[PDB]
């Protein structure tokens, strides 16, 4: 790790990606460390062997190297060099002369001349690179300079490098290497770092196309990758064979002196089955083994063989459990039938085909190719039982493991699932039946802090290095740590996991609540002074509208495509009409919702508040600019944690990703919620808290305001107001705590909101990230490029293969629009709720339980957020309760009993005298006669007091 | 993107539903039927543990409803033929255990039911259920009578109506119950036939010679096998993307019903509207 | 943005969230809806309406 | 066309008429539309290999 | 505009539409206003000139 590898490059046949994360196959085996230290002109010949004069470092296996890589560390100067490639067929050399003359020096001309045997040939270099920083070669013969591959040689037995450098610090490396599977991070098309996909955790990480996957749950399938025993089962019928054999005897007179592909002594290649009448030979016995047959005497470097044709079934594999209704194989042509070609290669350099094997066939269940040559009256049914295997059972193939079962099921012979995969079969012999379990069912694993821990499995076994496999209902679970049940660092509804992977059952949230206080003339407790708290919510409010141009998107600028589309304007008009009408509708709504008050916007000055110091919420002043308002602190923190086309037809930069989309035809409109009027709205709402009805326009101290809001819940009756002064110290502290949380259940609430915001943003992006990808694939056409399609075809057959592109593209587009409408029609509900609660909680305290916070509600702040709002519901929670002894009513000496005018009050005997308090606060109020009401019938269960002591309680007379 | 979306949505919704379920041990004990009185709401109260260390058991109206309506541990082992659900696992669909498990569900329901007979008292003891109804009545208006005929009359109609409606399970109220039952069987059918439609589509081959990839490899050499293979997956991925795009549209809409439910349970259940 | 008319900012005959257009095509920045509302009337033993 | 018999026609020459015909209607409501004006003549040909 | 063209007809290889709005290619160039006023049996030969 930490290797710069500035010279080191990627390899790509096609266009290179830039600044992306990509997993791929690269030749990155360290092999010999250097193998070229002190490189001189006599570099020698190395042939994919450990025969490299260098320090391998002992980490090199030295078995074989798939490719050879040359890394050059020289100043940017031209130094004479030659390249020699040795192959059995021929020796090819690369030379370049600085001087104008073709011979030049041993205008720059480079000639590579390749000579085979005693014949010498001359080749043309053509383009010559100004500077080459890296060189790549391979055994296959692919040639790569700076990643792209110019051309591929047929084969290279050995490679010799003729590079001569006077400089002692000649170069950095010429090494061997092999393929591997890795991941890479690329910036400006240049590598930054890589990750070998060897360990299980690394495997998952690479699969994630990212690094540092967040702690959570993932699924994996570990699969065996080796040959397995093969099992076959068929219906027993005494095999009657048919052998089809063919005798290709190419036997030419070498072919290296004049021509190999000239078909010399190529002649008779035939199979005994031909008839003088030469009726097509179709087998009758079901069992037949097709075989290629013997081959002609083979000489060095050249051969001939059969090739796959256009038929469904490849010859040679036909014998592998195939079905057919009528083979009818013929040597000459057969009407309406497939044919195959045999070709010959001279050192993989000449290809000459021969008309061979006309075959036509009917489908059927009678004829079936059998691999095993022996066919006769014999008993065989190989069946490996309890291991992973391949299988062919009654013409159905697959892989898995076989289990004996006990089920009569004498109705039939094969049982298949709804999906089409067979589940079990019954032997013809006796009646036993066997199930077919799949080899590697998916396993569920867990990761935390970028390491794997714990695992949900299916088998009572320790697959990984975990030391314990605790059996649990509905599943098994492995873990490598003891059980101490300290706490949970991850959770799911049923259960949570410990830090070390120990599993724990969740205990739901311990809470407590209150209820009606039935008058009972007995001991009861009322809440005393409370403490403040803050709760955070988030509501989706808007969706970034998108608009599409039908004709750009599908036509892509071809006039003929536009004209073929011209007859479909009835169709695609509806798409853009719907999108446009919906966009203007929703934008009209969101613009109708945003009010403003200049009277109150000025009040947002922090000097007006007091000890609360809600600095974060208040909008920022203009930064020496003529801007009405600026985003608040919690605003840019949120945005931080989370182009002009003017520059997309002009400029000198390469186009950006967003810019590209415009070219294709998608077009994201500017968002409805712009910052200027958004901030004015938020600031006006915030300033509506400190403004109360006054004859003058001036403000009043914030402290008085809170008291008034409290009066709403009940008549605060104290003259020295301790609450105003105590709750602020908790309030500003809670606020600093929560802004720190941005940068205690409240904490999990904030985590939930943040998770929801990143959720909606991902949900928005990957919609068009899915859209713009589908035009890269051609549904049925030869190629995606309409222009290329026109180039490759004349007027009659070009439009015919064109139109099936647009026939698919329109469907994809209609899918996209039908899902966008389904996003708008649903977000409208969230808009309704948001407008329904902002004007309720934000303006006037609610008496509705659970709508504004856990408990009684005082006031709420609001700020903006991406496509949404965020609230700050300040509430009250009881610190302690005060007990007290009450009376459910009063009885005078006369029959008349008195009660209270409204329920929310309650008498009690505080001391000698009686005091009547509120039911929701401990504030006490003086007794008086006006607070009572008369009812004739006296209940004994109340206070029993006569008219005499009545004067002692209320001054009646 | 497919599995990333499904997984993130699942963990999100499960976090929400786990955030909504509170509990009170003080009040759960109060669910003892002895505390109520003439009402005899026997059906609602949760059942006691059946000689087991289980916090709670489903109530009568619960198992009646379920009645009227597997482990993979046994799907790699055993001697039985695989079940339909078991088969789905083999294919690759996997239904997670439901968020609303019976233990904490029953604790939540029982605690809510016990929050009715509990009123603010200096002690933790209960008071007669009769007094409670009177207090709730006072909210609508100051009930002013000393000999409370309502407490004693309405219960005889109440328990009779309850026996009538549990019989209806096993008068507009009747059609209301019929509507609810129809809605439950509706949602259950609506849930099942989604994957009943999904798992059927791989049985058909869009353009390939046959569905079996293994057979396709058997029938062809390396050059022309992958070429006819890939058009299978090109269709299968589309079907899968359709399925995910419809599941997200189920979650985003059920979220509204969740909002309404939480908005009315804490309103009607706790304090008269 | 092209237009064939002078800028006099009289009024808007069409509108989008960011901006609205004049009758002759002149572009204008929208001023949100001038409104006013009320709030709690804290007892303060002073002038009020 | 009314009862399969012509009533009137609109030549697709002017830009506004072009948009109107594209709308498959007459009198499109005041609003926003998108258009692509394209050259329709031979252009110089460039090659690189 | 306002030409009745009652005789004038559409041209369609396939089945004719009825009472619809359709954009299409038609041979509608005015060219020679009349070119046949007072037509008699000796109308002569005109060859796209
Ligand atoms: C630009 O475009 C060119 C187009 O030609 C690309 O070049 C081709 O790249 C592909 C992919 O890398 C390459 O296929 C690979 O070839 C190498 C070498 O093949 C020989 O080695 C194997 C052993 O691995 C030997 O068995 C035998 O000598 C192989 O030759 C044979 O190939 C097939 C398949 O083996 C045989 O049936 C033939 O008979 C023929 O003789 C292989 O290393 C690589 O093999 C991997 O896949 C095969 C098939 O599934 C598998 O059998 C191997 O075991 C191996 O799979 C995994 O096994 C290793 C074990 O170490 C494990 O570590 C990894 O998981 C492996 O993936 C595969 O066959 C192809 O040959 C190249 N073209 C030519 C003509 O050379 C070039 O890459 C492009 N560049 C880019 C990216 O832009
Ligand atoms: C019933 O079904 C019958 C089936 O046959 C329909 O008859 C066919 O109708 C089509 C469509 O109208 C018609 O295609 C058109 O032909 C005329 C005449 O073609 C000759 O004129 C051009 C100049 O326009 C000359 O270049 C040359 O003489 C043309 O002949 C040649 O056609 C092609 C294409 O030009 C050549 O490559 C061949 O070599 C051959 O010699 C054309 O006027 C019309 O041309 C338009 O499209 C082409 C191709 O894109 C383009 O190159 C032209 O410039 C022109 O495009 C636009 O240019 C004009 C410029 O004034 C502009 O004003 C408009 O925007 C134009 O659209 C096209 O080729 C076809 O020939 C008819 N069939 C036969 C066999 O005659 C009949 O219409 C159906 N009736 C209905 C509707 O029910
Ligand atoms: C993927 O590759 C890119 C390219 O190297 C990585 O980004 C680069 O990351 C480095 C730190 O790893 C950044 O440097 C930091 O930049 C700030 C701001 O300039 C500077 O103050 C710091 O001292 C430090 O230099 C660098 O800006 C950044 N460049 C680019 C173009 O992204 C990226 O981290 C890699 N990611 C992985 C997972 O490998
Ligand atoms: C509103 O929600 C909050 C958070 O869920 C509740 O806060 C908490 O209230 C519970 C009482 O139900 C407090 O519990 C107790 O704390 C004491 C002291 O630690 C402990 O001895 C008790 O055994 C019990 O655990 C809890 O401390 C408190 N937590 C916080 C962070 O404030 C609040 O009560 C809810 N209000 C209502 C009306 O439900
Ligand atoms: C409810 O909505 C309506 C319409 O948005 C509001 O009506 C309007 O109230 C505003 C005050 O916020 C009035 O504004 C003023 O009018 C006078 C006289 O023209 C002018 O001198 C002031 O400078 C200011 O522009 C406006 O005339 C009035 N319009 C109508 C059509 O009634 C209503 O006030 C809103 N109510 C609340 C409580 O927000
Ligand atoms: C498309 O073509 C149709 C067919 O001509 C047009 O409809 C016809 O429009 C005329 C007026 O332009 C209508 O005449 C009015 O009818 C009423 C009721 O009979 C009569 O009281 C008026 O004095 C006048 O005659 C006529 O009814 C109507 N006929 C049909 C079959 O639609 C249509 O306006 C044309 N649209 C365009 C955009 O060209
Ligand atoms: C899981 O537990 C095993 C043993 O219980 C740990 O294994 C040791 O790991 C090191 C590093 O590979 C080996 O050298 C030892 O031989 C292992 N011991 C045994 C007994 O196998 C393993 O490290 C634990 N891993 C985690 C993540 O807990
Ligand atoms: C490379 O080593 C192998 C194994 O010894 C050998 O067959 C081969 O000949 C060596 N290379 C050359 C070029 O001889
Ligand atoms: C090119 O080929 C000719 C003929 O074989 C040979 O004389 C000449 O040396 C070659 N050029 C080189 C090797 O640069
Ligand atoms: C690159 O070449 C310079 C030339 O002097 C040498 O000093 C240095 O060690 C080389 N770096 C490598 C090979 O990484
Ligand atoms: C086929 O050709 C070869 C060589 O031409 C010859 O030996 C053989 O007899 C011929 N016939 C058969 C049936 O193989
Ligand atoms: C089938 O079974 C016989 C008996 O053991 C064995 O000789 C033969 O090799 C087996 N075939 C295969 C393909 O394993
Ligand atoms: C599971 O494995 C444990 C390991 O000791 C063993 O004791 C137990 O019997 C096993 N149970 C089953 C059902 O295989
Ligand atoms: C952890 O385990 C040790 C030993 O079993 C025990 O003494 C301790 O109390 C445990 N602590 C926690 C937090 O689980
Ligand atoms: C939470 O609830 C469980 C449930 O029994 C209880 O045992 C425990 O006392 C509670 N713990 C806390 C920290 O509230
Ligand atoms: C509760 O009420 C009783 C009356 O029976 C009284 O004696 C007792 O002091 C009360 N409890 C408290 C804590 O005041
Ligand atoms: C409540 O009031 C008492 C007495 O004034 C005081 O000691 C206590 O700290 C207060 N608690 C809070 C949370 O303000
Ligand atoms: C109080 O206001 C000052 C003014 O900028 C600010 O720096 C400080 O952080 C604020 N303190 C709190 C607790 O908000
Ligand atoms: C009235 O007093 C009686 C006395 O037995 C008591 O049982 C009843 O609850 C009382 N009713 C009230 C206070 O409404
Ligand atoms: C108060 O109640 C006592 C207890 O029943 C009763 O004896 C007495 O008469 C009552 N006093 C009144 C109603 O003034
Ligand atoms: C109900 O309470 C009674 C006494 O109050 C007790 O005997 C009985 O066990 C309780 N029921 C349960 C289920 O605990
Ligand atoms: C009353 O309670 C008993 C106790 O089990 C029950 O059997 C009976 O059915 C109940 N009656 C009604 C009407 O609920
Ligand atoms: C037979 O099959 C049944 C169900 O398939 C199973 O319960 C039983 O254990 C099996 N074995 C015997 C011996 O019955
Ligand atoms: C229109 O422009 C004229 C000249 O610039 C100016 O006098 C007049 O006040 C403007 N009126 C409006 C409504 O913009
Ligand atoms: C509307 O608001 C703007 C904002 O500054 C203000 O200048 C103007 O006085 C208001 N106009 C009307 C007609 O209310
Ligand atoms: C037209 O046909 C008539 C006979 O039908 C013939 O008398 C006359 O000469 C023809 N016209 C010309 C110009 O030939
Ligand atoms: C039509 O005019 C052209 C151009 O002068 C001429 O070539 C052609 O011959 C004329 N028509 C006839 C029928 O001669």
Residue numbers in the entry:
A (entry chain A): 50 to 155, 165 to 700, 710 to 810, 820 to 1033
B (entry chain C): 632 to 700, 710 to 810, 820 to 922
C (entry chain B): 535 to 583
D (entry chain B): 244 to 292
E (entry chain B): 50 to 98
Sentences reproduced from the published study:
The S protein is composed of two subunits, the N-terminal S1 subunit containing the N-terminal domain (NTD) and receptor-binding domain (RBD), which are responsible for binding cellular receptors (sugars and proteins), and the C-terminal S2 subunit possessing a fusion peptide (FP), two heptad repeats (HR) and a transmembrane domain, which drives membrane fusion by undergoing a large conformational rearrangement. Here, we report the cryo-EM structures of the HCoV-229E S trimers with two conformations, named conformation 1 and 2, at resolutions of 3.21 and 3.55 Å, respectively. Our structures illustrate the dynamic conformational changes that occur in the prefusion states of Alphacoronavirus S trimers, providing a better understanding of the molecular mechanisms underlying receptor binding and the transition from pre- to postfusion.
After further data processing, we finally identified two major conformational states: conformation 1 (derived from peak 2) and conformation 2 (derived from peak 3) with resolutions of 3.21 and 3.55 Å, respectively. The C1 presents a slender conformation with a total of ~145 Å long and ~113 Å wide, while the C2 is a stubby structure with ~132 Å long and ~117 Å wide, which is ~13 Å shorter than C1 and the shortest among the S protein structures reported previously. Meanwhile, we observed that the interaction interface between protomers decreased from C1 to C2 (with average interaction interfaces of ~4824 and ~4145 Å2 for C1 and C2, respectively). The RBD (chain A) interacts with the NTD (chain A) and the adjacent NTD (chain C), RBD (chain C), and RBD (chain B). This interactional mode between the NTDs and RBDs may cause the RBDs in C1 to remain in a lying state. Specifically, the equilibrium dissociation constant (KD) of peak 2 and hAPN is 36.3 ± 0.071 nM, and of peak 3 and hAPN is 6.78 ± 0.105 nM. First, the inaccessible closed state (C1) can transform to an activated state1 (C2), which reduces the steric conflicts for RBD transformation to the “standing” state.
